[PDB]
Design an enzyme around this catalytic site. Sequence first.
Site, PDB file in Angstrom:
ATOM      1  CG  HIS A 193     -36.021   4.489  40.435  1.00  0.00           C
ATOM      2  ND1 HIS A 193     -36.772   3.996  39.400  1.00  0.00           N
ATOM      3  CD2 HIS A 193     -35.847   3.480  41.256  1.00  0.00           C
ATOM      4  CE1 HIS A 193     -36.938   2.635  39.457  1.00  0.00           C
ATOM      5  NE2 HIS A 193     -36.387   2.379  40.572  1.00  0.00           N
ATOM      6  N   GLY A 234     -36.841  -5.319  43.918  1.00  0.00           N
ATOM      7  CA  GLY A 234     -35.453  -5.267  43.449  1.00  0.00           C
ATOM      8  C   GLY A 234     -35.526  -5.794  41.962  1.00  0.00           C
ATOM      9  CB  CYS A 248     -36.163  -1.356  39.240  1.00  0.00           C
ATOM     10  SG  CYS A 248     -37.932  -0.763  39.627  1.00  0.00           S
TER      11      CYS A 248
END
Lengths: 299, 298
Positions: free
Chosen positions: A40, A142, A144
């Site tokens: 993503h 943040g 991920c």
Amino acid sequence: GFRKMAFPSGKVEGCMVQVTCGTTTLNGLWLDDVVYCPRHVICTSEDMLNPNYEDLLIRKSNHNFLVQAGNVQLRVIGHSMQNCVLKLKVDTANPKTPKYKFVRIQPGQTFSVLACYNGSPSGVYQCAMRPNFTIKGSFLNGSCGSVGFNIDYDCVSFCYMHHMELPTGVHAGTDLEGNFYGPFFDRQTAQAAGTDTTITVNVLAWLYAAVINGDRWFLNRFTTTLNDFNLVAMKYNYEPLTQDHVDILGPLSAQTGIAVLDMCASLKELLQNGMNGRTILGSALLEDEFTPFDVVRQC
Amino acid sequence: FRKMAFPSGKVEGCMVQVTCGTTTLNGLWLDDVVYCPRHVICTSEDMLNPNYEDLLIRKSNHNFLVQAGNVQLRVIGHSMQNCVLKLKVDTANPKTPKYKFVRIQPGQTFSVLACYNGSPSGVYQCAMRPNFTIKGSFLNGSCGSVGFNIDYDCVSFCYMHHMELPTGVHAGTDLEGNFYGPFFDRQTAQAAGTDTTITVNVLAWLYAAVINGDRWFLNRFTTTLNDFNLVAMKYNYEPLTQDHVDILGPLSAQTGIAVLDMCASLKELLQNGMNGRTILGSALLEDEFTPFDVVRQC
Ligand SMILES: *[C@@](O)(CO)[C@H](C[C@@H]1CCNC1=O)NC(=O)[C@H](CC(C)C)NC(=O)c1cc2c(OC)cccc2[nH]1
Ligand SMILES: *[C@@](O)(CO)[C@H](C[C@@H]1CCNC1=O)NC(=O)[C@H](CC(C)C)NC(=O)c1cc2c(OC)cccc2[nH]1
């Protein structure tokens, strides 16, 4: 002493990078000449609402991806997608790549998490894959692309890449082939998990750890059969205990001289009587995030 | 909220093993010096009541085996500073981080990198108790393992491991070799003073609860710091220092709850109990999270 203990994180820190596509940024894992990150990253905030990932990725070029290792920018020379993970080919090999494997862990198994922000490692802690395929982590905006791992004789087994925080505050992610653990999907939507249960084999392993550390107050003179224990366990939303679990607990039972089913009778008493304000290894709750291996390795 | 250790890589690159005779433990290699517990020079019989000055007399540079992995680092000088040995080696460690040596206060947390034979084994957070012990996890061969904090890539080393007490807690020095607490590096059974609860960290925990919307315990009262300190000690809580009040500053400003108002809220919790209520999903007040830890996780 008995503590939640993570693996030393150095071998993984040297692999963490920052990946940026437009206004979207997260962490990537840089092994040899490939950077792995959540797919993503290619989405704008509006795309994440309902992404058609293969359609969005065909519209991207190599130059759309900004990968930073520290202050150095690595040029993307190719990109592919494997399930929910993006694989960015770069022109530089990571000289700090450890020996590594990608593994899909089983529910109830533990791993260390290296939480990262903007490509920089922030903290390290131990997590278990819950029976409902969530993990109780500590992850902020943040995070991920932070990864979970185990280390066995200098070989890093990567088992988790971070993608999502559920509304209940627990966390969801994928293995390094990009397949989610659990019935979750990478869309900006509120998702509930299945009903969680307690990892029984880990609770027993942890009661053994307590005995190895000189605490025996919860023990009793009773015993139980495997099936009678499992009936009570299921009534208390504990996972069933299998004969493989009994065998895996063998060394700890041998070390302490407490038969596994004698320890089950102890746990049964704790479940039916409560702890009555007492504590085990500092905890007022039955802890289920140490595997039998975690206990043996530390003790 | 959970106990989060610092990433350990900058410290892993500094761990070596130090052997004298058949006695092996861990050392810390920074620039061209290796720091390690001085009892490495002892024979198992010598540890019972050692005269370290006399023992070190009978030792030369060539009695010390310093290894990074299996690679030997040649010792070119040696000296003792309190309870640590400083071995000058002929190689400057290329992995030396920006670092300093600091002596921490009770209640401060740090990460421990547990090591065996110079090899890192695991990492976890510890808090220095008011009785100057830590609830560690250390086996044989762990001495010389270090505790540290990392601020902006600078590693502040604060702990070097020496001892397990009969009660199972652990004791050690700072990196200038001065013990935390009333302990000595000899093979003797030593007891720590009675411990107390770390008040400043409980207050940090209550701030964390307020940050997360859990504020039923906020009262309508206030106190003076002196009045609070006198009541706290009757509940086996630590008295607050002026430094404690100032490290709670950021959390106080973030929540708008004055430090002394939170002290009054804690005072009521101590005198009247929780009455079967929880705070951050727990019946027990947590005292191992510093105000800095709360900020870093919130
Ligand atoms: C990543 O870092 C994204 O790059 C981020 C990590 C979480 C943010 C807060 N804590 C975290 O662990 N992940 C997300 O933001 C993901 C993005 C998806 C996979 C595209 N989304 C969520 O975690 C998310 C979205 C929603 C939601 O919507 C509407 C409603 C409720 C919960 C929720 N979680
Ligand atoms: C280092 O590994 C030693 O180089 C070791 C670490 C402990 C072993 C078990 N867990 C640990 O943390 N340290 C020691 O064995 C030290 C050595 C001293 C400083 C010379 N000694 C003790 O920790 C020790 C000795 C005694 C004792 O005597 C008699 C009686 C009771 C407890 C006790 N601890």
